[PDB]
Nucleic acid binder design. Structure first.
Ligand SMILES: [Mg+2]
Ligand SMILES: [Mg+2]
Ligand SMILES: [Mg+2]
Ligand SMILES: [Mg+2]
Ligand SMILES: [Mg+2]
Ligand SMILES: [Mg+2]
Ligand SMILES: [Mg+2]
Ligand SMILES: [Mg+2]
Ligand SMILES: [Mg+2]
Ligand SMILES: [Mg+2]
Ligand SMILES: [Mg+2]
Ligand SMILES: [Mg+2]
Ligand SMILES: [Mg+2]
Ligand SMILES: [Mg+2]
Ligand SMILES: [Mg+2]
Ligand SMILES: [Mg+2]
Ligand SMILES: [Mg+2]
Ligand SMILES: [Mg+2]
Ligand SMILES: [Mg+2]
Ligand SMILES: [Mg+2]
Ligand SMILES: [Mg+2]
Ligand SMILES: [Mg+2]
Ligand SMILES: [Mg+2]
Ligand SMILES: [Mg+2]
Ligand SMILES: [Mg+2]
Ligand SMILES: [Mg+2]
Ligand SMILES: [Mg+2]
Ligand SMILES: [Mg+2]
Ligand SMILES: [Mg+2]
Ligand SMILES: [Mg+2]
Ligand SMILES: [Mg+2]
Ligand SMILES: [Mg+2]
Ligand SMILES: [Mg+2]
Ligand SMILES: [Mg+2]
Ligand SMILES: [Mg+2]
Ligand SMILES: [Mg+2]
Ligand SMILES: [Mg+2]
Ligand SMILES: [Mg+2]
Ligand SMILES: [Mg+2]
Ligand SMILES: [Mg+2]
Ligand SMILES: [Mg+2]
Ligand SMILES: [Mg+2]
Ligand SMILES: [Mg+2]
Ligand SMILES: [Mg+2]
Ligand SMILES: [Mg+2]
Ligand SMILES: [Mg+2]
Ligand SMILES: [Mg+2]
Ligand SMILES: [Mg+2]
Ligand SMILES: [Mg+2]
Ligand SMILES: [Mg+2]
Ligand SMILES: [Mg+2]
Ligand SMILES: [Mg+2]
Ligand SMILES: [Mg+2]
Lengths: 117, 116, 58, 128
RNA sequence: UGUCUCAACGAGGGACUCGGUGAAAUUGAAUUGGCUGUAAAGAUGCGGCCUACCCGUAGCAGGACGAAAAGACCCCGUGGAG
RNA sequence: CCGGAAGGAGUGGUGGAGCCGACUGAAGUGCGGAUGCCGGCAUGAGUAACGAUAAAAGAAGUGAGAAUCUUCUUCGCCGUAAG
RNA sequence: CCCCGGGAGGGGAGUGAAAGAGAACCUGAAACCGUGGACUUACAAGCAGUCAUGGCACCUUAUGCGUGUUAUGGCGUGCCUA
RNA sequence: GGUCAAGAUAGUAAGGGUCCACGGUGGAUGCCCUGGCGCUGGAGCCGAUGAAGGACGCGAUUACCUGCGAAAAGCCCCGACGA
């Protein structure tokens, strides 16, 4: 019995083409170039899934020592002094948000400045 | 470059340029008015104007001058004894052109030139 | 073959890029003052043949 | 006017094309015909017939003829108001293609593509 | 004696503009700059720095190790033929 | 939407007469590559070209439509020829 | 039979379950060409994606939920063969 | 409110881009059989009484195919069938 490709190739192909969506030019309408684009897209995906966590670490750090310098401290100094004070163990995420609620971050700064004199 | 110009080459050599302007002067004189390409009309206007001014002199010299260009004897006769005398008190401007839109095949724009 | 030749096929985008300059100009048509049809300027109203007076047949 | 299944909606709703007319298989390339048609577009149908009288392309002809069937069909088959028509839509699409092989230097051949056109245009009572 | 110093002017046929008909080789895809550096050792495409509004038309040939023929030289094959 | 993957189902649109699921068995059974094959359609691009530099002009006619067909009168080209 | 057209082609009318079958006559994918609409782009350096966030738009496996688009930031050297 | 100043920002799209919608191209895919393929078995020589294979003809009207052969889409006898 013969068993020609029939329905199968078109269906895998459409699966890739639908992954394409807003890909510029042939990247979204010709199969081979869509497939190949998605190879490099795999690369980018997995590695960024890692990276985003370095990213938000960086951003919270920026904001935290921005607030720390608002009061005459700095990230090195404020983070250490908080660490010295019965280990606060707030995440760097959480210290930022208290850089959206200044009256508290202030007291955290005075507390870090304490366990440090 | 080209900062002084006698007219046009059309797309023809010295011999033809002449044979054309001659033939077309002959036809406009025989026929009162004719339509042709707007270009070839603008080129015709002064040749034929000067030709009628030559014939406007009457003497055998002017007729033989006209015979130099209008080699058909009846047109020369008409221009000599009919048309030029009519243009007696007209100081040039023996001729006019008006333009009549565009042709099908080459998409060129024709116009008419006629005696005034 | 053909000494100069093109390198990559040109994009669907850049090809229509060049073409932004081929749109035709519509005639500045005007209403003929006697035949009540439309005519090109400084030419003779095709519909009635008129040009202030009337030069051409029909 | 809800129905229950396809076949009855098919046998009692015949589905028409107001203002529409097509010139199938015109022997011109769609690119040029599109230049003319693009000048016609959202335009009063009078000016459509005008502009087409005075525009120097070889394709002004068939595009004019089709512009008329629209008008005709709008006013005969569809009962519209001619003093109110306009070109609500107009477009050119590709027909089949007459391929003619042609000779060339030093023995080779070559395929010339005489393209054809589907010129459709569609008129309407430009209200607002 | 325009081969030349040293090129000029003129002619026609193209090239240019409009209307009709309308190919080709080539083409991984392209949102396709300069310097310097680095990289499989000659970078639009990596790094730094500079420069740069979008899109065409006529033209020049430095790059795209431009195009054409799975190098004819050279070596290799326990290949071939005269 | 679902499954860990290959993949699978729901629903809506087309379509107009055959077809899912399960178990077993047999395969011409899974494509991006081969300067692969057949076919279709693109880019170059409205670009180059329209095939001897022996020219063509006007009037009149026919026709849905004429630079290109017919008629008239001129013009130019071959004439040990292009008779 | 009627309409525009020299025709070709088409729009109606009528047959038929159906003309979403009309003789370029089953389905009718994709490349490829177009029309309309949303969101968008004329200081800009680009393997075209990816992550992140804001803006705008829509709500039939669908209101925390997305889906489409987009601005800016980070990151980022096509595929295969050898 | 008005002028002057300084600063910040909007919209415009020649064209392009992603998505959607509707078509056109093209003829994949599904269904189908008017056509093939193999195995099994059967049957197996035609011709000087003219072979095989052809040419030219035969029709009211005939270009192609079929059938026929100047007695030419056909003639005679027998059997079958019964519009
Ligand atoms: Mg970490
Ligand atoms: Mg010329
Ligand atoms: Mg006359
Ligand atoms: Mg004088
Ligand atoms: Mg019915
Ligand atoms: Mg030959
Ligand atoms: Mg010169
Ligand atoms: Mg010159
Ligand atoms: Mg750029
Ligand atoms: Mg180095
Ligand atoms: Mg370098
Ligand atoms: Mg990059
Ligand atoms: Mg660089
Ligand atoms: Mg600038
Ligand atoms: Mg050159
Ligand atoms: Mg090379
Ligand atoms: Mg080799
Ligand atoms: Mg040997
Ligand atoms: Mg599915
Ligand atoms: Mg049925
Ligand atoms: Mg196989
Ligand atoms: Mg392939
Ligand atoms: Mg592979
Ligand atoms: Mg091919
Ligand atoms: Mg030539
Ligand atoms: Mg007539
Ligand atoms: Mg003539
Ligand atoms: Mg000629
Ligand atoms: Mg002739
Ligand atoms: Mg006569
Ligand atoms: Mg002879
Ligand atoms: Mg009829
Ligand atoms: Mg008809
Ligand atoms: Mg239909
Ligand atoms: Mg159908
Ligand atoms: Mg078709
Ligand atoms: Mg048809
Ligand atoms: Mg038909
Ligand atoms: Mg059927
Ligand atoms: Mg079909
Ligand atoms: Mg619009
Ligand atoms: Mg659009
Ligand atoms: Mg900007
Ligand atoms: Mg981005
Ligand atoms: Mg200001
Ligand atoms: Mg526009
Ligand atoms: Mg069978
Ligand atoms: Mg025989
Ligand atoms: Mg007979
Ligand atoms: Mg026969
Ligand atoms: Mg006999
Ligand atoms: Mg019997
Ligand atoms: Mg019987």
């Amino acid at each position: 019995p013969r068993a020609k490709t029939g329905i199968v190739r078109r269906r895998r192909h459409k699966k890739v083409l639908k992954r394409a969506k807003g890909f510029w030019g042939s990247r979204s309408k010709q199969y081979r170039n869509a497939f190949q684009t998605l190879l490099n897209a795999a690369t980018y995906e997995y590695r960024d899934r890692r990276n985003k966590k370095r990213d938000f670490r960086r951003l919270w750090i920026q904001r935290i020592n921005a607030g720390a310098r608002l009061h005459g401290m700095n990230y090195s100094t404020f983070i250490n002094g908080l660490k010295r004070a019965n280990i606060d163990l707030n995440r760097k995420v959480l210290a930022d948000i208290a850089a959206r609620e200044p009256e508290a971050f202030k007291a955290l700064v005075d507390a870090s400045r304490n366990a440090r004199q | 470059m080209r900062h002084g110009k006698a007219g046009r080459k059309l797309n023809r050599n010295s011999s033809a340029r002449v044979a054309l302007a001659r033939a077309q002067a002959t036809a406009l004189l025989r026929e009162g008015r004719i339509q042709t390409t707007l270009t070839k009309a603008k080129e015709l206007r002064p040749f034929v104007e000067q030709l009628i001014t030559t014939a406007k002199g009457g003497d055998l010299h002017s007729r033989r001058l006209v015979a130099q260009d209008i080699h058909d004897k009846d047109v020369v006769r008409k221009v000599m004894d009919e048309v030029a005398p009519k243009y007696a008190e007209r100081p040039g401007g023996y001729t006019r052109i008006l333009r009549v839109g565009t042709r099908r095949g080459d998409g060129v724009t024709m116009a008419l030139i006629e005696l005034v | 073959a053909k000494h100069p030749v093109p390198k990559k096929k040109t994009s669907k985008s850049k090809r229509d890029m060049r073409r932004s300059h081929h749109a035709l100009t519509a005639p500045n048509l005007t209403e003929c003052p006697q035949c009540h049809g439309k005519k090109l300027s400084h030419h003779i109203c095709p519909n009635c043949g008129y040009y202030d007076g009337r030069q051409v047949l029909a | 006017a809800t129905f229950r299944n396809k076949k009855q909606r098919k046998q009692q709703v015949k589905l028409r094309k107001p203002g529409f007319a097509v010139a199938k298989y015109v022997r011109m390339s769609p690119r040029k015909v599109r230049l003319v048609v693009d000048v016609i577009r959202g335009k009063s149908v009078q000016d459509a017939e005008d502009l087409l009288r005075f525009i120097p392309r070889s394709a002004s002809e068939p595009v004019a003829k089709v512009l008329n069937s629209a008008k005709a069909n709008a006013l005969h088959n569809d009962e519209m108001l001619e003093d109110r028509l306009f070109v609500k839509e107009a477009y050119v699409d590709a027909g089949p293609t007459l391929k003619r092989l042609i000779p060339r230097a030093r023995g080779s051949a070559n395929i010339i593509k005489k393209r054809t056109s589907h010129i459709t245009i569609i008129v309407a009572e430009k209200g607002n």
